[PDB]
């Protein structure tokens, strides 16, 4: 019946198999370049060409990441009011490549003198490159996600759900490629060759759109709507009556989806802190060697999470697209976010248990292992015991990560698409920054949880339990908000 | 509108304030007597009048508890087919008082010779008394709960929801009275006076119904329905067609509510194990003294849980009857069970954290404290640190315990009321027994979690984490079952 019809829709892609693979490949290459920059920025800045202090490099990376979140709302508005999505993404990719071209030249010893030969050694060029890269990334992220789902939007709302699966899969495949191959070359072979590859990736990602301009679905720009709902918004949030035709409906949609985005700040707060502290714990756990180029990169550890995601996304798809559809289970995009939050809390609890075990074991004996150029003191507890953690968050990223994008896409006005995604990725950055502040809070002398690269004297288990409690409170609040919204 | 109407219904009781207080008082007295028997049965059996071994007394108490669960389905059937609820409860209370009269006589030194003067010293009389008490308790429990809600059933389904709140409140008040006063006298003053009081409670509970026979709502017995849906059930589970008039509907209801009861076995499995191991942990924690009669009873520790429940039930009622009704939040009786399971899992995790802290602290120093007539080795960690546990389960008993009874009452055929409650209380016993088996499982030499009254050498934290995992899996399964049922 209806189920049969929906399963038949799941039979999507179909005609448009080109228009999609192009977007998937473009996002893969863009993510590969982004992770190539982000993985080893601090090592590059604190090295031979640049004599920046560790604090300066950390602040530079923090500003670069913050720019990629702050520029998203403005990148989305530019792609809706003044330009189309295709042209905006093309301009953003051109700017991203321009910012890309700076780092290989600085890495090269011959061309470094031309740029900055004659505190910070080469602050202007590096800052300009980082600003350009951040603006390009912010404009691409806020615009590629709705542009890709535009091709599959005609076949109802299950084709856009299948597309957002292989979009996340391509993102994670690009992350694996960048953090595995490029991050290895950047630290073992040379920085020139390690930074030339992501530039070539950006160059190839630009060619794909030019080749695929004949198969994409475009929408004419419309800034009149933005003017109507920004300039004369203060004149009113509802009850337009005879004045205005249906723009009051999209004003209602905006003011109704803002609270859902606001209630998701603690989710990102916990999620980014889990990204950081999980790697912190992995560094202090027994890591086996691979050979008899040395000192495997620390970025490889992050790969672990994404390594799960790939193996889950096909499987899940099959074992979720029939199984959960013919039974009418979990159809909405908000209950899936709730399930993701539940599994985030479970992962936090598992991490706390493992950290308590590690802190109990470390009092007996400790070994030294080198990662990069620094030796960490680790207990004699195998790294693979951290596998149960990464499953639970991985399942979370199966549910909460994709469903968040689906909700941001579907529950948004047609005119302001790619601008609601801008707010989504901006509130993600706000959550990341408040999470950094939370980490700074528990590090004070009054609490002393994170008073000290060795964490054998820091109670990471209490931090994990606090994150679990925050995630539980967020789960309850989000359940209430989702019920009220529906 | 509709909300207003429902809030007005909440304005219940109203006319029937007598018919209810009578049921509440009867259940209070019955629970006081039951907890008077259960609290100190082992101490009585292993003492001066009786020279039973500890294993024999434990087996006797286990059989007594198992009888109270096994007799529930048959007690409910007797109250529906052959008798009315009022007459069945009166007969059960008479039998309960008859079984009650045995223990004071055995405790008294003069009358002990008349009963058993001339292995187990007085097995026949004690076994007969325990059998009579168990049958009486089983028949009362399966019949008092639907009889009490019968008075308030006319004013829609919010009066039966308010009644089931003050019913649980009266149960917990009776538990506090029995475990605080009676359990104190049974161990400090004398067993004769400590067992005379619950007999007087049973006697008073019998008088209340005789006084309230003029204000109760009764239903004529109907065994023809039981014959129709038992004897010729094998002839068919649906599609009756011209044969039968609407009994196929109640057959459908039975076969549709059986899976929900089956999926609740792990809930009771975890809940009873939490009842036991929480007291086990409380015994090994620093307990302050009260005076300068000595050796406060161990049963007082159980009081802790119920001590919360009282303070929650009024408050909750108010802060849930307006607040959660005008907002249309959590109206069904199964989502409340799901919330209770969530809080059970959270309590298990908190208990595991506290147990890990206690096991870390015990390695430094240990103190000795006497409870009853046995000294426990306890860490120097305050007992009140166990408060966060008992809140989380207490909230659970606010949601899962009451809503389970509401679902058992509402989702049941009109003819088989008090027989579905029999199955409810029987599956509760099945869950209790499988929980006892689970505790016996983790005590084997292969696992060794509970290899040994001192638990300083037993990993209770791993047991708590296993209970939390079981509760999470039960939460997921129950969510799926509840969605399919609705
Ligand atoms: C006892 C004190 C702590 C009050 C507890 C309130 C919390 C525990 C309970 C009470 C009200 C509940 C919410 C009421 C609103 C809904 C909508 C319901 O359809 C799905 C669950 C959800 C999201 C509930 C989540 C849990 C909840 C927030
Ligand atoms: C979703 C939430 C409720 C999960 C519960 C996690 C929190 C509330 C629980 C888990 C472990 C619990 C702790 C268990 C052990 C200790 C150590 C003791 O020295 C003080 C109490 C304290 C600190 C408890 C505080 C509350 C606690 C931290
Ligand atoms: C609802 C469920 C999933 C909650 C998760 C609880 C379980 C699955 C988690 C919580 C703590 C985790 C443990 C953390 C620490 C250890 C000790 C180590 O020597 C073996 C792995 C092991 C044993 C992990 C096994 C999985 C684990 C027990
Ligand atoms: C990835 C693997 C572990 C599959 C995971 C399945 C579990 C995690 C998910 C998938 C399907 C989900 C259930 C689908 C059915 C429903 C009905 C929905 O309206 C409420 C939630 C509930 C009860 C979901 C609970 C969580 C659930 C059981
Ligand atoms: C660990 O490092 C410390 C500091 O250099 C050193 O003294 C100690 O011997 C090292 N242990 C091992 C096993 O290398
Ligand atoms: C605890 O009990 C043991 C065994 O009787 C005893 O030897 C020890 O001294 C006791 N400790 C205290 C503080 O009483």
Numbering used by the authors:
A (entry chain B), B (entry chain A): 18 to 135, 150 to 267, 301 to 356, 361 to 520, 525 to 558
List sentences quoted exactly from the publication behind this structure.
TASL, a recently identified innate immune adaptor protein for endolysosomal TLR7/8/9 signaling, is recruited by the lysosomal proton-coupled amino-acid transporter SLC15A4, and then activates IRF5, which in turn triggers the transcription of type I interferons and cytokines. The architecture of SLC15A4 lacks a bulky soluble domain and the TM domain contains 12 TMs that mimic the canonical major facilitator superfamily (MFS) fold, with TM1 to TM6 forming the N-terminal bundle and TM7 to TM12 forming the C-terminal bundle. Here, we report three cryo-electron microscopy (cryo-EM) structures of human SLC15A4 in the apo monomeric and dimeric state and as a TASL-bound complex.
Although the structure of monomeric SLC15A4 was too difficult to resolve due to the low molecular weight, we successfully resolved the structure of dimeric SLC15A4 in the apo state at an overall resolution of 2.93 Å. The SLC15A4 forms a homodimer with overall dimensions of approximately 70 Å in height and 110 Å in width. The TM domain of each protomer adopts an MFS fold and exhibits an outward-facing conformation, toward the lysosomal lumen. The SLC15A4 dimer interface was mainly composed of the TM9 and TM12 from the opposing protomer, and was stabilized by a number of interactions including the π–π interaction via F417–F417’, the hydrogen bonds interactions via N428-N428’, as well as substantial hydrophobic interactions. Our FRET data are consistent with our cryo-EM structure, and strongly support the notion that the SLC15A4 dimers observed in the structure, can occur also in vivo. Structural comparison between SLC15A4 in the apo state and TASL-bound state revealed that TM9 and TM12, the two TM helices playing an essential role in forming the SLC15A4 dimer interface, bent towards the dimer interface.
